[PDB]
């Protein structure tokens, strides 16, 4: 209802208005991946347990590559894989 950026209330009509309707057939036949358009009607009954449906591990805090040589090379805990 907020983060999908297409079911947004104030600026969702601007997203739904100019689709760039791809009057070229090659622009529609180029991409062959899924759209994954999340509708507004998705409720809490779908995906009840967020850990069984496989999540992603969060990204680490990125550091500057010019100052990457001063990282602590020894970690606190043993991390596997």
């Amino acid at each position: 209802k907020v983060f999908v950026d297409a079911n947004r209330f104030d600026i969702g009509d601007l997203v739904k208005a100019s689709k760039l309707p791809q009057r070229a057939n090659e622009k529609s036949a180029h991409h062959s991946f899924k759209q994954t358009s999340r509708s507004r009607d998705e409720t809490c009954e779908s995906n009840p347990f967020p850990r069984l449906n496989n999540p992603k591990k969060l990204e680490p805090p990125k550091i500057l590559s010019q100052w990457s040589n001063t990282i602590p090379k020894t970690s606190i805990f043993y991390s596997v894989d």
């Binding site: 809490c44 850990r51 969060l58 805090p61 805990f77």
Partner: protein
């Protein structure tokens, strides 16, 4: 007919509304009903019926009053009211949303400030609102979007080019998750310097003259002078970068790489045993830093996923008690813990002691009135004994507070009050349905007087002997408590009470019922009556 009349007479709307109002704490029913109401208005505009818009506003208000921890739906209804024309109602919805988390929710501050970047029409009020968000929520770990937005607003609105340096210098000491973008902005803004006189935008001139041994007004060849300035400031920034990098790397690699859920799902959800444990570990780390805004922020962040598990409520209440000596804060924590937690035993038991330390006992009586009226004066037939016993201790304390003593030796009447003994006897008459039977029998024998022990032995124990109920005659712990009542008298001698217990109790109990009494009476006889062991053995022997 319009869409509102067709919405009333529709068959699905009544069924969805009754399934919502049948189980109000099922959030999926609320979301299906809300999506059906929004689907009923496929054009959403200001030209629709206000008789349906009032129903939409009442539905959102009921959903946000039933579930105030939903972060996205305050944003949804606030931008809905912004779509419907007005912004004062949207500001009221944002204010009650930020009050629902008590000013410590990052997403609502971020969405409210992205809203306020267009609607405020005033610069000083925007700066006061962003500084309020800075002093309350500005120490959040994942607040990169908030500080990126605030630096963007400073770089777009301010023309003096001084407040940006101040805020970015503050950010270079805060342990943020996305922190290296701010260091990269700092390093490319040091590169974007034009002369030496802008070094007063960083610090004062005496701190440059003392710590870095550099002058602003040093005139001459300022090329290598400014290059040495850049090198020394880059070295100081590199040292502070190592400090903040070690802090953020420690917090991530120990704590933040384990928590996968940071949002409020539902009161019906389940959170894994890893995440609860890592929230407790992260808050134990957070208490040690002794930064108060960050500590209250991280406790609110831990109240975000799992406020129904009641552990972080009691932990944050105990932290406000012992570490700060701010106990009204813990009282408000335990008051708001009643509104969300499902296991309301330990929070109310701690809140009793919190109220009793404050010496506000009319508030304690008004609180206990809500428990004794929540059952409609039927607290003796409750399944959970932990509620009734924690009620009964402090209700006995209040009855000792109001009424004076009846017995001698300055002994005030405890559980044997006219408003208390009937509630105990109403529970003891069930004998198989209500647990905590022997707890009262061990706690009604804690008076130790001459007339009060006689009073207790006359009201219940002689009455159990007179009726002859099967459950108390079968259990030997009942007779153990009855013998402990007489044997610890403070007025009788040893020989008279010993003759009493041996002669006029042990022949009274049944011989065929002694199979469950003898494992409980043998311990008492080995405890206090050593020479009376073989006498009791010859009474309960295998042959007549």
């Amino acid at each position: 007919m319009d869409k509102y009349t067709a919405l009333i007479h529709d068959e699905n709307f009544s069924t969805l509304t009754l399934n919502v109002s049948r189980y109000p704490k099922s959030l999926a029913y609320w979301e299906k009903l809300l999506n059906y109401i929004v689907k009923a208005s496929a054009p959403i505009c200001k030209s629709t019926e206000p008789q349906l818009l009032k129903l939409i506003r009442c539905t959102y208000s009921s959903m946000l009053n039933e579930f105030p921890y939903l972060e996205n739906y305050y944003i949804d209804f606030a931008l809905l009211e912004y779509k419907l024309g007005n912004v004062s109602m949207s500001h009221k919805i944002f204010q009650r949303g930020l009050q629902a988390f008590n000013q410590r929710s990052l997403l609502l501050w971020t969405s409210y400030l992205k809203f306020c970047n267009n609607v405020i029409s005033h610069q000083k009020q925007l700066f006061k609102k962003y500084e309020t968000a800075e002093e309350y929520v500005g120490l959040h770990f994942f607040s990169g979007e908030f500080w990126d937005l605030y630096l963007e607003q400073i770089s777009s609105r301010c023309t003096s080019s001084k407040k940006y340096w101040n805020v970015l210098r503050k950010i270079l000491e805060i342990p943020l998750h996305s922190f290296s973008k701010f260091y990269a902005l700092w390093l490319q803004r040091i590169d974007d310097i034009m002369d030496l006189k802008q070094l007063s935008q960083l610090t004062s001139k005496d701190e440059l003259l003392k710590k870095l041994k550099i002058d602003i007004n040093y005139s001459g060849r300022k090329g290598p002078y400014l290059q040495d300035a850049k090198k020394k400031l880059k070295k100081i920034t590199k040292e502070m970068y190592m400090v903040v990098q070690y802090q953020v790397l420690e917090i991530y690699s120990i704590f933040e790489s384990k928590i996968y859920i940071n949002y409020y799902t539902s009161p019906e959800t389940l959170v894994s045993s890893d995440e609860i444990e890592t929230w407790i570990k992260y808050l134990d780390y957070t208490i040690t830093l002794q930064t108060d805004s960050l500590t209250h922020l991280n406790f609110q962040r831990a109240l975000l996923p799992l406020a129904h598990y009641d552990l972080v409520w009691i932990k944050y209440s105990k932290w406000l008690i012992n570490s700060k000596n701010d106990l009204l804060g813990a009282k408000n924590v335990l008051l708001m813990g009643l509104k969300f937690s499902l296991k309301k035993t330990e929070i109310i038991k701690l809140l009793y002691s919190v109220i009793c330390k404050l010496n506000e006992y009319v508030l304690l009586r008004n609180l206990l009135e809500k428990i004794e009226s929540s059952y409609s004066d039927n607290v003796e037939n409750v399944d959970d004994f932990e509620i009734f016993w924690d009620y009964l201790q402090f209700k006995t304390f209040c009855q000792n507070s109001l009424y004076s003593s009846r017995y001698s030796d300055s002994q005030s009447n405890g559980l044997l009050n006219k408003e208390l003994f009937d509630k105990v006897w109403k529970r003891l008459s069930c004998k198989e349905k209500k647990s905590g039977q022997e707890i009262l029998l061990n706690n009604l024998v804690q008076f130790y007087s001459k007339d009060t022990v006689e009073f207790v032995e006359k009201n219940i124990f002689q009455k159990i002997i007179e009726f002859g109920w099967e459950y108390y005659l079968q259990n030997g712990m009942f007779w153990n408590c009855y013998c402990r009542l007489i044997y610890f008298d403070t007025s009788r001698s040893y020989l008279d009470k010993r003759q009493y217990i041996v002669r006029k109790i042990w022949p009274q109990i049944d011989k065929k019922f002694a199979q469950s009494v003898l494992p409980s009476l043998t311990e008492f006889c080995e405890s206090y009556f050593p020479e009376e062991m073989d006498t009791l053995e010859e009474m309960f022997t295998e042959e007549p």
